[PDB]
Structure formats: C-alpha cells, structure tokens
C-alpha cells in the first residue's frame, strides 16, 4: 500500500533532449553477435513450435 501511494507526486515536465538522448544511446553498443546461443535458441524455438503444433492437434 505504501508503495502504491508513494506514486502520488505527479510526473516530471518533459523535454525532447533527455529521452531522445537515451533512446539514441540505444544506438550502436557493440555488434556482439553470438552464433552459438542464437542457433541453440532457434533450435529450441523450432522444438517448442513442433511439440505445440503436435499437441494442439491429433498431430
């Protein structure tokens, strides 16, 4: 309860600079591509999709 009322002080006044700069900082941070993990994850995604399509059907 104390939390849910700790939010009672209104929002700050906005300006393009800060938020635009943060979502800009979402720019290049290192083209760190990891083929092993993405491949393992695509494999498990295929597997989950396959087992789900099997279950939600006679199959």
């Amino acid at each position: 309860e104390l939390l849910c009322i700790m939010r009672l002080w209104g929002h700050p006044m906005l300006t393009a600079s800060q938020a635009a700069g943060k979502v800009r900082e979402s720019m290049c941070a290192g083209k760190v591509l990891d083929f092993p993990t993405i491949m393992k994850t695509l494999a498990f995604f295929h597997t989950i999709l396959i087992n789900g399509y099997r279950r939600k059907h006679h199959g």
């Binding site: 760190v32 591509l33 990891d34 083929f35 092993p36």
Partner: peptide, 26 residues
C-alpha cells in the same frame, strides 16, 4: 592402398572437427 583409405578417413574426421571448432563461436 587401403591404408591410404584410412588416411582419407583421418582427413575427413580432422576436417570436420577443425571446421566445427571453427564455426562454433564468433
């Protein structure tokens, strides 16, 4: 020449192992 054939086998297995360890990580 059947020994040349086993060396062919060694060639293939070494190739697979090396290229695997190669393409494994970025």
């Amino acid at each position: 020449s059947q020994s040349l054939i086993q060396t062919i086998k060694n060639d293939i297995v070494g190739l697979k192992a090396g290229m695997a360890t190669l393409e494994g990580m970025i």
